[PDB]
Design a protein around this ligand. Structure first.
Ligand SMILES: CC(C)(O)c1cc(F)c2c(c1)C(=O)N(Cc1ccc(C#N)cn1)[C@@]2(OCC1(CO)CC1)c1ccc(Cl)cc1
Length: 92
């Protein structure tokens, strides 16, 4: 665990383009726990194949709405506080 359980559990409201992303992989609500947002972001990453076998912990999100939302061309799945901060930029 890198992120406290209580923080993972908290209900959040995605801004519209993050909601678009979540809805494109089957999410059907306006509010989610951060853990739920992360689950659907993972579904999106795996669906769009934003990964590479040579660097298995890197999400390659350039030229993708996810990259626009997070403001980076790539990031490491191991850096959870950095991921949370990128999500917070996208919550109401
Ligand atoms: C192959 C690759 C690049 O290594 C990869 C891709 C991937 F999509 C996931 C992982 C790894 C991984 O470990 N995940 C779980 C995770 C990672 C970090 C945090 C935080 N803070 C929370 N959860 C991901 O989702 C996994 C899954 C849903 O749980 C089945 C679809 C995931 C979710 C969301 C984000 Cl933003 C980033 C990553």
């Amino acid at each position: 665990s890198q992120i406290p359980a209580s923080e993972q559990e908290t209900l959040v409201r995605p801004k519209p383009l993050l909601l678009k992303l979540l809805k494109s992989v089957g999410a059907q609500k306006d509010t989610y726990t951060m853990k739920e947002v992360l689950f659907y972001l993972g579904q999106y990453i795996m669906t769009k194949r934003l990964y590479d076998a040579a660097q298995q912990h890197i999400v390659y999100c350039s030229n993708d709405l996810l990259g626009d939302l997070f403001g980076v061309p790539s990031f490491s799945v191991k850096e959870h506080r950095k991921i949370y901060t990128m999500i917070y930029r996208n919550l109401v």
